[PDB]
Amino acid sequence: SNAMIHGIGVDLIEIDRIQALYSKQPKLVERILTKNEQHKFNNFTHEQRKIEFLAGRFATKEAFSKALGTGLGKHVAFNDIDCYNDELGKPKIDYEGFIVHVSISHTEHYAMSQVVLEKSAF
Amino acid sequence: DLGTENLYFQSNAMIHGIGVDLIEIDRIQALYSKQPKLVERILTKNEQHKFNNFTHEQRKIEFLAGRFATKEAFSKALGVAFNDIDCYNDGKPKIDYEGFIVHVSISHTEHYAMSQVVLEKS
Amino acid sequence: QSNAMIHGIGVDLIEIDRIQALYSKQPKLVERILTKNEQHKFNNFTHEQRKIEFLAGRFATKEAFSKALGVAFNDIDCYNDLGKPKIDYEGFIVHVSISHTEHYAMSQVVLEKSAF
């Protein structure tokens, strides 16, 4: 554990899969998003923006899990990873022991997210 | 120290920021075909020279789409006009930006272009 | 050289259909792409769509690694440790991540410089 980066993660998600499931099970939102993220999700005036936000959050959490190492990451509830936005709108995640770097991108049909977990200490 | 909230000043991070961008090539094609002059707002002179010398139209649009994704990913990692961001090739893509070490990678498929950027402070 | 912590990064996005076509047409190319270890996993998949998916992810990983480095594809052994994908290459700490959807596979690689 001499490396300064603990791990990296990336996840690509088809918007139509998220849309399908949200339509088939609206309580999907409560299973992926924190209360804070739900507040945001419910505040979007446009349904397509809601689905994009949800897809981006799902991809981000999957990327975060992959950066941790799936063997550990699968034990972290989505509800416990709060991806919030700073004052410039940049996505952020706080997680003790790391400096978490996140980036999200959207097209009409896909959402993707990248996470790099930098170690906070030597 | 000094009692400032300035994030850059206080930061102990090795990575300054990361950025990813996914672009649908069809959108770039549409944009170019119905507004060719915007290429002057996206590409530097050297990039335009290269853009203009492509013999095949599809490779021309791919180059543009890849540069658009790169400038967006760079912009997101930095936290600067696109036509002042010169992404050149060693054939590795690279961006020189005073004060930083800029790491870039670009990938293309038939329908999508993507780029990722990681910035370290010098 | 440089005082940089990172040597290079790479990303590759690949259309699954293209890999499907490659395997259908020229199944012998797999031995030029996959290491013997990877071929073992590949051969062990009982579901056709999941083995093409595995192949596509490994092709993207080799492409991404190659781009980050700036080595033969079948000499780049990507194995799983907690299930995290890993590649050993002397001089670096190789960070890798792979993602799949129905139609695309992608991989990203960050080559961190080792303070030996």
Residue numbers in the entry:
A (entry chain C): -2 to 119
B (entry chain A): -12 to 66, 73 to 83, 86 to 117
C (entry chain B): -3 to 66, 73 to 83, 85 to 119
Direct quotes from the study:
13 residues in molecule A (MOL A), four residues in molecule B (MOL B) and three residues in molecule C (MOL C) of the 24-residue N-terminal purification tag were modeled. The purification tag of MOL A in one trimer docks onto a solvent-exposed hydrophobic patch that is formed by residues of helices α1, α2 and α4 of a symmetry-related molecule C (SYM C). The helical part of the tag is positioned above helix α5 and between helices α2 and α5′ of SYM C, interacting with the side chains of these structural elements. The dipole moment of helix α5′ may have a weak stabilizing effect on the helical portion of the tag. Glu84 and Leu85 of MOL C contribute to the interaction by contacting helix α5′ of SYM C, while both of these amino-acid residues are disordered in chain A. Leu85 is ordered and Glu84 is not observed in the electron density in chain B. The apo-AcpSSA structure reveals that the intact purification tag may interfere with the binding of CoA. This could explain why no suitable crystals were obtained of the CoA-­complexed tagged protein. Cleavage of the tag was inefficient for AcpSSA, possibly owing to inaccessibility of the tobacco etch virus (TEV) cleavage site. Cocrystals of CoA and AcpSSA without the purification tag were also poorly ordered.
The active form of ACP is produced by a post-translational modification of a conserved serine residue of apo-ACP by a 4′-phosphopantetheine (P-pant) group transferred from CoA bound to a holo-(acyl-carrier-protein) synthase (AcpS). AcpS belongs to the phosphopantetheine transferase (PPT) family of proteins, binds CoA and its derivatives and requires magnesium for activity. The AcpS trimer binds three CoA molecules and three ACP molecules. The AcpS monomer has an elongated elliptical shape and possesses an α/β fold.
